[PDB]
Design an enzyme around this catalytic site. Structure first.
Site, short mmCIF file in Angstrom:
data_model
loop_
_atom_site.label_atom_id
_atom_site.label_comp_id
_atom_site.label_asym_id
_atom_site.label_seq_id
_atom_site.Cartn_x
_atom_site.Cartn_y
_atom_site.Cartn_z
N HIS B 88 -59.32 26.16 -18.80
CA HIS B 88 -58.23 26.93 -18.20
C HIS B 88 -58.90 27.82 -17.16
O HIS B 88 -60.06 28.19 -17.33
CB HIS B 88 -57.53 27.80 -19.25
N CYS B 130 -56.76 25.12 -14.65
CA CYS B 130 -55.43 25.60 -14.32
C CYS B 130 -55.06 26.85 -15.10
O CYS B 130 -55.72 27.21 -16.07
CB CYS B 130 -54.39 24.52 -14.59
#
Lengths: 232, 232
Positions: B88, B130
């Site tokens: 992430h 992301c």
């Protein structure tokens, strides 16, 4: 396919913002040699085929309007677009004569379908915003939009050098390599060579012990989707 | 002479960090589809000739430690070095199992000064990271020195729409182009094609109005000084 189509009446427009003298309110100084760079870039890009226009000591308001208008012009017959910024700069922001402006704002005007006539076409931004501040030593982003490419003279958090007489190393390199391979090499080869050229050999230094010997390297940010050659 | 000398005992090392699960405290959820990317990337980078190593669900401290120890090895007989981060991410920071580490700190271990063994050798960083949920409205950084190259799945500011069944598009594209042309195309050519493929979206037919058919474009930051071919 693999290459941006260059079949158009013109290569496209080249805006050159040459900010040399700044106000007292900004606290910045005169960027001597920026005229040697601006003329060199002018000739070089002009001979590449761009319809180059040079604006001097622009305010943040102008640099801004200057690019909004351009993004508004019709480029149906242009192959691409190129903007060249020569000024003082810090983080994601360049200096206008009367202040400072976020690069993202300048390139926003072209972002995606906000300039349909240039969609699918390469938008080039060459930025030489010397004095980021905090230099180097010596060893040995924006548009979130496809088809944009940036070439930074300094880098995110450095201090690129030159000479108040001979001009910037980046520009000298950029111009020299373009003034000889501009029409036979893909844009990334051109730029990679400029990188080496600025890295190798040159080795940044100063007349002040606080800025003495600080190796810099240009930076290329690419969102391109094809290979870019200037020979249409 | 305009390209990286690839005549060494070996191509170099390829460190893949596969972060799928995260501590609840981080609020970050499971990254379904990451194992698929990691498995594809590993096979792909292995067929290229890299000595691939896969780490999974690492903590921030582990990511820092393994990357540091890798920079402290002797790469004298390696052509280059590659690192792939699958986790992430957010504005220039990447997620560990337990938190957040700045990307510049992870990649700085390899800066010329602190990794003399890899000076003048391409240091490659592929990053697929992301964020995680919140939508807008609508009115009306990294190590900056020679031979460094970063490939981000999405231009810092958006979301790389992966896929819990076939992996992320960026990774799926990277591997595809790499298996086909990995041995004859120069990275910029390869990654430029990657930008084009993920660009050929065709709608990420999601469910929520907030994540229903938007946009994503990878970006490459190149600090390279020569052409990089994984051959000769």
């Amino acid at each position: 396919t693999y290459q941006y189509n260059m079949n158009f009446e013109k290569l496209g427009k080249c805006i050159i913002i040459n900010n040399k003298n700044f106000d007292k309110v900004t606290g910045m100084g005169v960027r001597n040699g920026t005229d040697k760079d601006a003329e060199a870039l002018f000739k070089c890009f002009r001979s590449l085929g761009f319809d180059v226009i040079v604006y001097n000591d622009c305010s943040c308001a102008k640099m801004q309007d200057l690019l909004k208008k351009a993004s508004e012009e019709d480029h149906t017959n242009a192959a691409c677009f190129a903007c060249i910024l020569l000024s003082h700069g810090e983080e994601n922001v360049i200096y206008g004569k009367d202040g400072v402006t976020p690069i993202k704002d300048l390139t926003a005007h072209f972002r995606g379908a906000r300039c349909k006539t240039l969609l699918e076409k390469p938008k080039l931004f060459f930025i030489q915003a010397c004095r980021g501040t905090e230099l180097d030593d010596g060893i040995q982003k924006i548009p979130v939009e496809a088809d944009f490419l940036f070439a930074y003279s300094t880098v995110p958090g450095y201090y690129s050098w030159r000479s108040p007489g001979r001009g910037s190393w980046f520009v000298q390199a950029l111009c020299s390599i373009l003034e000889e391979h501009g029409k036979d090499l893909e844009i990334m080869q051109i730029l990679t060579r400029v990188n080496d050229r600025v890295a190798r050999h040159f080795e940044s230094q100063s007349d002040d012990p606080h800025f003495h010997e600080k190796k810099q390297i240009p930076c290329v940010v690419s969102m391109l989707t094809k290979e870019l050659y200037f020979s249409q």
